[PDB]
From Swiss-Prot, chains A, C:
Its main location: virion. This is DNA polymerase processivity factor. It is found in: Virion; Host nucleus. The gene is UL44. Belongs to the herpesviridae polymerase accessory protein family. The chain holds residues 9 to 271 of 433 of the full protein. Forms homodimers. Interacts with host SMARCB1. Interacts with host NCL/nucleolin; this interaction is important for the organization of proteins within viral replication compartments. Interacts with UL112/UL113; this interaction is necessary for efficient viral DNA replication. Interacts with UL84. Interacts with the uracil DNA glycosylase UL114. Interacts with the DNA polymerase catalytic subunit UL54. Interacts with host IRF3. Interacts with host RELA. GO terms for biological process: bidirectional double-stranded viral DNA replication; DNA replication; symbiont-mediated suppression of host cytoplasmic pattern recognition receptor signaling pathway via inhibition of IRF3 activity; symbiont-mediated suppression of host NF-kappaB cascade. GO terms for molecular function: DNA binding; DNA polymerase processivity factor activity. It comes from Human cytomegalovirus (strain AD169) (HHV-5). Accessory subunit of the DNA polymerase that plays an essential role in viral DNA replication and acts by increasing the processivity of polymerization. Forms dimers that binds to double-stranded DNA and UL54 specifically to stimulates long chain DNA synthesis efficiently. Plays an important role in maintaining the structure of viral replication compartments by interacting with host nucleolin/NUC. In addition, suppresses innate immune responses through effects on host IRF3 and NF-kappa-B. Keywords: DNA replication, DNA-binding, Host nucleus, Host-virus interaction, Inhibition of host innate immune response by virus, Inhibition of host IRF3 by virus, Inhibition of host NF-kappa-B by virus, Inhibition of host RLR pathway by virus, Isopeptide bond, Phosphoprotein, Ubl conjugation, Viral DNA replication, Viral immunoevasion, Virion. The lineage of its organism: Viruses, Duplodnaviria, Heunggongvirae, Peploviricota, Herviviricetes. The keyword Transport does not apply. The C-terminal region is required for viral DNA synthesis.
Swiss-Prot record, chains B, D:
Replicates viral genomic DNA in the late phase of lytic infection, producing long concatemeric DNA. The replication complex is composed of six viral proteins: the DNA polymerase, processivity factor, primase, primase-associated factor, helicase, and ssDNA-binding protein. The chain holds residues 1223 to 1242 of 1242 of the full protein. This is DNA polymerase catalytic subunit. It is found in: Host nucleus. Belongs to the DNA polymerase type-B family. Signal peptide: none annotated.
């Protein structure tokens, strides 16, 4: 039996339903990485934004740890959106086998059906990762995230201003409207530094929506180790949603 | 290497094989 | 090598593109039958209408004639619309193997991909067939079909009246509007008998649209061997479209 | 026998196996 990575259906099904919106909107700029951890990472790449969804160990089962990491594009030659297909309510078994170093053999089952598909592997795919520490790090209650979404929602940029002492975070719109959160029971400020970044409103809003699916707190960090990036993430017991946005001039 | 990242993201990335 | 039925892609691709509308609208009431003829039959069943699409020998290739007829529902457990999937512009190989008497093993290829699926077989499926001769048989130019479509188009029933001598065919609407075609260079009357049938306008209109995809003549017959049925069909060098409608009270 | 036909169509039908 070749190294096999299987999905534990109960939690995996719960997970994709919460991510339905995200999964359904995936296009051609997304990769799926299967790791022997076990782990499943979906990474969507845009010019100034990288979105990543990581399913944790509780959603997977791995037999043999010699399973070589496998990466494929989500846009499959005849089936189209791969992850969307795994969201089918009929799915009863889903597993990936490491037969060749060149492809991933994916098997799926449903009541009186079974299917197998071999997808060529992508080599050297770069996966964006959250930095150890950073210039700014704030945690926000889900309710704060909801406030931000409500305030922004139905091009342009949004300025994110962070203040030292007392700690504070402000979101500024081009029209001179500002939403601020001071240190209190709804937001925890770990690392703070006086700085202001500018990000694309659309990607920022989209990032907040992606994180909101957890209905749990979010983390916002501004990293300056290299080029300035804004990091917005949230997680639950099944997956973690992470987004990295670059600055707009 | 399928999806290329803009230069700004490269230093914050690692190869899928050295991932967790 | 097990008995294999393969699709000759050039003509098959030409065929499904002409049938795009029909293929895309298929739901849960359609079966796909693979025959060693070779032949591929799609049959859609409704209460007062049965629609059948038969792909001829020129669209298929069969190795071994001991290939047992295989029938599956078009609505596949995870892939959804089966025939729609075969319409993918990326398809480079499509074949069905007769491994077991219980299922059909379907294989599909695309540039750096290959997929296989096993669908449980339907047993004892009844396939409606055109009768040797009939009470009425008229052939109509495509232009006549276009006139009918234009006249009806943007519930209710439509009366079809046929006259003996001189031969004539009339389509009557509830609002007292009638469209008639007399024996001439556009319509050929083979068998005629004085009779009038009533069919559902919706299924009739839909039947005309299905036949119109050939841009070639149509055949209209009224069969009375058993229960009265209206038969409307058309064909080209790749497939034949046939519809059987029952009478409305 | 998956898709059942209304009685009116039965006499005009044949089993898939005896088809062409």
């Amino acid at each position: 039996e070749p190294p096999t990575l299987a999905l534990r259906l109960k939690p995996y099904k719960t997970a994709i339903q919460q991510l339905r919106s995200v999964i359904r909107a995936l296009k051609e700029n997304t990769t799926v990485t299967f790791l022997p951890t076990p782990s499943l990472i979906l990474q969507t790449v845009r010019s100034h934004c990288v979105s990543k969804i990581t399913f944790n160990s509780s959603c997977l089962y791995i037999t043999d740890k010699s399973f070589q990491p496998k990466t494929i594009n989500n846009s499959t030659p005849l089936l189209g959106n791969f992850m969307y297909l795994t969201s089918s309510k009929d799915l009863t078994k889903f597993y990936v086998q490491d037969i060749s170093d060149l492809s991933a053999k994916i098997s799926m089952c449903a009541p009186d059906f079974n299917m197998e598909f071999s997808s060529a592997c992508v080599h050297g795919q770069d996966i964006v990762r959250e930095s150890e520490n950073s210039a700014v790090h704030v945690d926000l209650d889900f309710g704060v995230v909801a406030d931000l979404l409500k305030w922004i929602g139905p091009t342009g940029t949004v300025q994110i201003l962070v203040h030292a002492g007392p700690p504070a975070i402000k979101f500024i719109l081009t029209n001179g409207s500002e939403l601020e959160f001071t240190s209190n029971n709804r937001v925890s400020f770990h690392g703070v530094k006086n700085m202001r970044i500018n990000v694309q409103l659309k990607n920022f809003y989209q990032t907040l929506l992606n994180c909101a699916v957890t209905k749990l707190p979010c983390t916002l960090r501004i990293v300056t180790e290299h080029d300035t990036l804004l990091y917005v993430a949230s997680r639950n017991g099944l997956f973690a949603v992470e987004n990295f946005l670059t600055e707009e001039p | 290497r399928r999806l290329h990242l803009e230069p700004a993201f490269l230093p914050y990335s690692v190869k899928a094989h050295e991932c967790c």
